[PDB]
A paper describes a structure:
For this purpose, we choose the hexameric PNP (BsPNP233) from the model specie Bacillus subtilis, which displays great biotechnological potential to produce NAs, including the antiviral drug ribavirin. Analogously to other hexameric PNPs, BsPNP233 is a trimer of dimers where each subunit interacts with the adjacent subunits forming two interfaces: the catalytic, which contains the active site, and the inter-dimeric, involved in hexamer stabilization.
The crystal contacts are similar in the crystal structures solved in P321, P212121 and P6322 but differ in the H32 space group. Analysis of the B-factor distribution in the apo BsPNP233 crystal structure shows that the loop connecting β9 and α7 as well as the N-terminal portion of α7 present the highest B-factor values, highlighting its intrinsic flexibility. As this region surround the active site, its flexibility may be important for catalysis.
Residue numbers in the entry:
A (entry chain D), B (entry chain F), C (entry chain E), D (entry chain C), E (entry chain B), F (entry chain A): -7 to 232
Write the structure that this text describes.
Amino acid sequence: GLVPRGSHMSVHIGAEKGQIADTVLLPGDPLRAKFIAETYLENVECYNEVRGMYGFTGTYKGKKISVQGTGMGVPSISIYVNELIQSYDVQNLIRVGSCGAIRKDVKVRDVILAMTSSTDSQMNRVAFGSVDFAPCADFELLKNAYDAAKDKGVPVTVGSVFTADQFYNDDSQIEKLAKYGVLGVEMETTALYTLAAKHGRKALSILTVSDHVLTGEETTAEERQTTFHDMIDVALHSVS
Amino acid sequence: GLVPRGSHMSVHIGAEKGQIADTVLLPGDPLRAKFIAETYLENVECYNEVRGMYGFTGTYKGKKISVQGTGMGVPSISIYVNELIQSYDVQNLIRVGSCGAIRKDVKVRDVILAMTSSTDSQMNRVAFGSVDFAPCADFELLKNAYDAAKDKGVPVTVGSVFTADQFYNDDSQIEKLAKYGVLGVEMETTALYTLAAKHGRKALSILTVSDHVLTGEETTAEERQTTFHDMIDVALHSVS
Amino acid sequence: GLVPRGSHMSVHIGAEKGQIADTVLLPGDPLRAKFIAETYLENVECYNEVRGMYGFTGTYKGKKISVQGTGMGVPSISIYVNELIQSYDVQNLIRVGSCGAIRKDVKVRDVILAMTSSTDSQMNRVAFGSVDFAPCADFELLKNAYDAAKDKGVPVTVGSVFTADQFYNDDSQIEKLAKYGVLGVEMETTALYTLAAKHGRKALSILTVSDHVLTGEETTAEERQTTFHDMIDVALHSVS
Amino acid sequence: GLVPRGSHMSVHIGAEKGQIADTVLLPGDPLRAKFIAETYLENVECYNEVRGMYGFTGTYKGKKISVQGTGMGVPSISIYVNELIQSYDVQNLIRVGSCGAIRKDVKVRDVILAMTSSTDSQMNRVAFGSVDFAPCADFELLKNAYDAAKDKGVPVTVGSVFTADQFYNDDSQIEKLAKYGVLGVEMETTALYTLAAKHGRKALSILTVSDHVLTGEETTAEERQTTFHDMIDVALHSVS
Amino acid sequence: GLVPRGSHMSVHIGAEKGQIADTVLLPGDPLRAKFIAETYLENVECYNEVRGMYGFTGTYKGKKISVQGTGMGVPSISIYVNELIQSYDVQNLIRVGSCGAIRKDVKVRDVILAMTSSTDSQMNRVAFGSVDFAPCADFELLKNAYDAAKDKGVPVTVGSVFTADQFYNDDSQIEKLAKYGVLGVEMETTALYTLAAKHGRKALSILTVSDHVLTGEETTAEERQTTFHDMIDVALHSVS
Amino acid sequence: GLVPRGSHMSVHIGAEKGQIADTVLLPGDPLRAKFIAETYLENVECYNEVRGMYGFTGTYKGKKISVQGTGMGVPSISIYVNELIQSYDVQNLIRVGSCGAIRKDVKVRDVILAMTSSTDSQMNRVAFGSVDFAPCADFELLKNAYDAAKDKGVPVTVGSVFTADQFYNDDSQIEKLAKYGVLGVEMETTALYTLAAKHGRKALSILTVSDHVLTGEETTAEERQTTFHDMIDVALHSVS
């Protein structure tokens, strides 16, 4: 190929049978996938370079864990999640990413566990028409993560998020969503939760606050990096 | 009035401030409201008879608790939940009701805790248009309920439900909903969860299975009554 | 059961074959069902106590008439109307209820006969998708009611209503509906008219004004009660 | 102009103030407008030739009546009805046209009076969004027409119709519409009823059967023409 | 018939096979169809008088060309285009009409070639539901028209238009459409392009400016008539 | 930062304003952006490494050109296009990518120029509601591309495409879209064309066939690489 190609079984992932673990962390940024795998895992290998969307496999306290970049937005993560599920038999899928907080009571240091997500994606209206489908986290994964946070005293907030198609949106309804108690905005959760459930696999999204969208309250690198480490510790402890 | 009238502040509830507790159990059937209050609570008073939609307040373990029938469907529960929240300052709202199970893996003895609900009600499209709003349980209540169930060894399943407008529906999508992991069908949760969140109150729906919609298999009175009691016990332990 | 159970053939109505008349009046309030049956009919029997949603049968000038509370909202009346039609072979279904007036020209003393109803329920979009279905009264019933009113001099207005899902609605379009000539808001007619037509039965909604929703002009008990009497007289004279 | 031009106040009608009566019959075919005016009215003048969409004014038993072709479809009739209402102060608008019957029980000789109409036009969703708006005939006009038919012994049916955007429609739902009681299909009524009501004017559609859509039962010229004459006689008598 | 009838094969066109050319110009105004045929073509015959929607066939530099009025709006043109395509085997369909300009940069003398059209017609949502279908001109016709205009120095602008259902529309989104680059508003192109494409025929809409919608800046007869002649010259040269 | 960060002015592009050209080629795959820049351009520098979404700038025959990976799907390309337009004042935006052909008449060697795109993205319904917005290519770029292809003898097809949200879609309407003349499926064009038009910039999507969706017929490496090189050659000649 002119550039790396996927496998016949997975057009966007150039891996073979067995190279991807049953449990996969899913950051949006493939360079964060790299950073996570190299910083937290042992015996790391890169199994995918197709489209520069790096995927890695290594071990955490003897258990195989993969870390796969998803890109941004429902259509991008849907491609990777479908291929992970259908071609690599992945069982547990945990997004680890950022969100923009939309309520003042959402604190910079809180690790957010998404129970569900609202969206302006049409993906579920395409499937259900007049039905509003509410995606749902796997409770076992969510509870294990909450327990991992609580056991250490890591601040954790459990609620809902909004999965946006338009990062830049002149027609945003973030103010109203915040009034209805939605915690923050990201670009992946609705797809991860819907596709995992449709195929009987377990999904969870863990998120940290990268900014406060409505107040412009600033975040610092120290705050963001500490909370990021807590997020990855929670994700890994919860599956251990 | 020709029949009992609501109060000026609450057109559908004939009570006065203080007569309803800050925690209210919400069965759909006002005769189950009566049964619950008289069976489980002490020193019970009926504070509402408007439209025969009985509401009661009594004592459980040193606190006042109320039990208010809601009727069936999003529009009916919305009227009672709005009035309880806005006129009686209710803080914790816990639906206790039945659902039709739509998956083989949902057992007759399972107490269901709804994380979220899908719907064919237009109530959220009316507010949000192109946005699919995903209603969300209060996790504090949900986790307390889960912990109460686990403490006794009551079987508990945590996931999503479908809030139907049409109990009889030629255009039902319950097969597809079940494929997407939805546990069962009921007629209230979307409204309870959306309105509680909009007003910063805490809600949870606890459900027991009254029938298996897709396999057709019937429940026994012994199965239903056992699980009903388990649901009420769990409910009475959902608020810290 | 712990509380009254429906019959096998009608989950929400605990009656047997023959106990319900072929002509049924449908107030929303089951206590008004009781008031109507006991005040206007002879030899009254209560055939349903399931969910406290009382239904009665008696005679009016030798004709059997039933009066069945429906509860509030499209989902609730849909349950009762489906069971009445499919399980008890009911032929004539006449709602007798209240509405909030939305036009200054609608007088508190006018009995309203609904030709059709607009709605924000999704029930018909669930069935028809891109089609806007316009529910339609049975003209024979409507004509007979109009003639009954005119023969005595009872004030009568014929036009359309709006069937709301949300009695409390921050996103109401009642101002625009009034500009388009809609008379008032209630919570049942769309379902009654659509379901009766689907099954080839005759329906009509007769309504009286409980409130002036936009002008804030209040109604008195004397006005409401006289007009209620006129409504029931029109319903019964019209079927005689 | 290269061809006849509308007036400054009415882009599609080349008339002056006063040339159009306050009561206007609205056939879809401008040649039927000519036929009706010439055959039924005295001292006929043609007030419009713009776009060949003929409009005429004459007298029937001394009352001024106009007959204006509308063309086919919601957008075409909307142009004429808006201009008639807004620029010529028209008060009573009565469509006289054809429909395709969609029920076996609709008889070829029955004159149809439309109480309301369903549609697949987006015109009302454009205005109301999540609301299904149900257009409504003026009851005074409808009742006058019904009484004129009964007085003259003309067979008459009253019910609802469907206003189609697509005369040829691979995605038609007319079989389902017929099951819900809809009598026939035409292409104008939703716009006439909605726009007349929006401006506080009176409208009615009277229709005769030109075709049996679902059965291909045949109609004859003699049947069609006799019933057409009945329709026009009903329209004119109802207005005098 | 009381007035002219269509043929059995084409309900709205009273012609026989062979009488209509494989290339048809489609003005909305049948009097403009007449003007075009009589002014530009030789040996003209009128093949249709049904509903006064005149169609003509003649020759231009020896080539058979038909000119068929369409009426206004998606439903009217859809009737004529369906019949032309399905009953008369028409291959090339070129609308020649007017539009209201919605941008300052669209000049009164510019001949507009529409690449595509937006709409508020539901015709494509009826077919595709959640999909936004974008109708597309045949590029060969478009390029031939472009080349014909350039050859003479006739000013030409290529871009998109908006096909409106409501010429008079209180809920218009013209301002937003102009911001997204849409050139003008007309009432036919979406239907023409969609139906031509569905049947593998070639379509193009050529348009001239009759009005500036947002500024009320005036056009004169001399401007409109000169540009009209340019439009017909481009259409005919382009098929020569 | 833990990984590369965007500029304050462009959250997802870590470049200084002067590092990006006024003309940007937009492949979905950032490794194809690398290949394009290294293969075709002189004096190449990489200006972005944020999220591994590489962007490069060099010269082609003396003209400054950038090549920026967009990722897959409307939300991803919308981020990059908004930042290019708003923060780097990019004027010409040309997607160079793959599509799945959906018609037998689309040949493997055909370079496709998209005039417009349909979609199942909700992005335009979010903005326009009841309006179907049809995105439009810049005709100047399209015509230059067409002219360049013809000059070289590269087979070119001009028509419409479908912008999918779901690469894997159980509810796909590909068969119907092909019937309506749509050429192929990709995941970016609607966003590119909509956002460029909204901001008065010029856009075009050029596409090559990666496979035949509906016949399973595969392409070969030699076919794909030949046509890729044709596409880039054409693109490098689309700006006037």
